[PDB]
């Protein structure tokens, strides 16, 4: 049972370095092939090269970037190391293995998400979104959560600590003049809320910042 | 280096019925016995899965619902009977030489029966307006097809700067999608101002669903 799982800073500065390890349990990397694949904003999917079993690399000559990949056999990792990096460095890298009996990229990471931009980061703002002021109700509410004003990328919600899954819609991030905006909509009985205490857990721990904000109901 | 060119983009697909997705290389990948072009498979959030291998070899695990087929320079994969979780982005890939090179992607949708939008307004919070802000919120929750119109109106007059306007991915379970919408202002422009409302225009009705609140009601 092979897993392999990324790691690395998530934020970096215009031409400075970048590097990147990939994990290896349950298979040893002096047997096999190992390789680092990324995808751009978009969906695009490119290949950057290998480390082979006896340490020989390859790296794709049709690269922008200036590329360095090593390992570590006492650890069972192996590393991707950019040079000089740009702002078109931004992408997701996964790791990847190429098995002599397979002949595939059939075992994945995770990945890892990586921005490159000089631009401070920023906390964000967590904003509460009670039902209109009126009394009116139907069979059930919904309710939400406003992230606003952050950077980078990203950032985690939850409801209640996880115990609230169902009924959840978490909208992907929006970019607009320089910070990120994303929200959350909860949806639950009418009985259920305000009697029993909703809350969006927010973090993001490129900014220090956890923040737990209870909906509260509207006073006139 | 080699190209390879996926066709289509974007291909929706009733549930039980099957999709077809193509895959054309600069250059042939085949080489005496063997092909070399492979399909992944990348749900949203995750990263890409291996499905065929060697152009028409079944990754263990892989539902048998999953096939490939070609050599040479075309290839294709078939998905039949096409289920809610395969809402996915497909790509081919070939190992014939180095460099290796991805397909652009295919994503599939599940054709969905068109289904309205839950619709939900959201007033400033005192906490934002303290800080000299006012964001206005639309929610749009569990609707089909996947384009949908939504306007603003400040005291029945359009407005369309300042608007972020964010969808999900496809719902893997019910193959629905839902959609924020925030119109962002000053604290003193919100408060010159009385009545604010969206309106969503989709094909699934005749007339735009209207949610509206005033200020100075309550």
């Known amino acids: 049972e092979v897993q392999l799982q990324e790691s690395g800073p998530g934020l970096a500065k215009p031409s400075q370095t970048l590097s990147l390890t990939c994990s290896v349990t349950?298979?040893?990397?002096?047997?096999?092939?190992w390789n680092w694949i990324r995808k751009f904003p978009g969906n695009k999917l490119e290949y950057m090269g290998y480390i082979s079993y006896s340490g020989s690399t390859y790296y794709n000559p049709s690269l922008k970037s200036q590329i360095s990949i090593t390992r570590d056999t006492s650890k069972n990792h192996y590393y991707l190391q950019l040079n000089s990096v740009t702002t078109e460095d931004t992408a997701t890298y996964y790791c990847?293995?190429?098995?002599?009996?397979?002949?595939?990229?059939?075992?994945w990471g995770t990945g890892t998400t990586v921005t490159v931009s000089s631009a401070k980061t920023t906390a964000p703002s967590v904003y509460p979104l009670a039902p209109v002021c009126g009394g009116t109700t139907g069979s059930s509410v919904t309710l939400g959560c406003l992230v606003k004003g952050y950077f980078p990328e990203p950032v985690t919600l939850t409801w209640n600590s996880g115990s609230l899954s169902s009924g959840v819609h978490t909208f992907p991030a929006l970019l607009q003049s320089g910070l990120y905006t994303l929200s959350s909509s909860v949806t639950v009985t009418s009985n259920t809320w305000p009697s029993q205490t909703i809350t969006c857990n927010v973090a993001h721990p490129a900014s220090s910042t956890k923040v737990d904000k209870k909906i509260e109901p509207r006073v006139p | 280096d080699i190209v390879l060119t996926q066709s289509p983009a974007s291909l929706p697909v009733s549930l039980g019925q099957r999709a077809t997705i193509s895959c054309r290389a600069s250059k042939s990948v085949s080489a005496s016995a063997y092909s070399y072009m492979h399909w992944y498979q990348q749900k949203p959030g995750q990263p890409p899965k291996p499905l065929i291998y060697l152009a028409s070899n079944l990754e263990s695990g892989v539902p048998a619902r999953f096939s490939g087929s070609g050599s040479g320079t075309d290839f294709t994969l078939n998905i039949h009977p096409v289920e809610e979780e395969d809402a996915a982005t497909y790509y081919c890939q070939h190992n014939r030489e180095l460099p290796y090179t991805f397909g652009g992607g295919t994503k599939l949708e599940i054709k969905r029966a068109d289904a309205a939008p839950t619709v939900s307004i959201f007033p400033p919070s005192s906490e934002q307006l303290t800080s000299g802000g006012a964001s206005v919120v639309c929610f749009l929750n569990n609707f089909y097809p996947k384009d949908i119109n939504v306007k603003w109106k400040i005291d029945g007059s359009e407005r369309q700067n300042g608007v972020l306007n964010s969808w999900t991915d496809q719902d893997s379970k019910d193959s629905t999608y839902s959609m924020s919408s925030t119109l962002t202002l000053t604290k003193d422009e919100y408060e010159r101002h009385n009545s604010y409302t969206c309106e969503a225009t989709h094909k699934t009705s005749t007339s735009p669903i209207v949610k509206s609140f005033n200020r100075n009601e309550c």
């Open positions: 349950g298979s040893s990397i002096t047997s096999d092939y």
């Open positions: 990847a293995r190429q098995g002599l009996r397979n002949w595939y990229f059939d075992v």
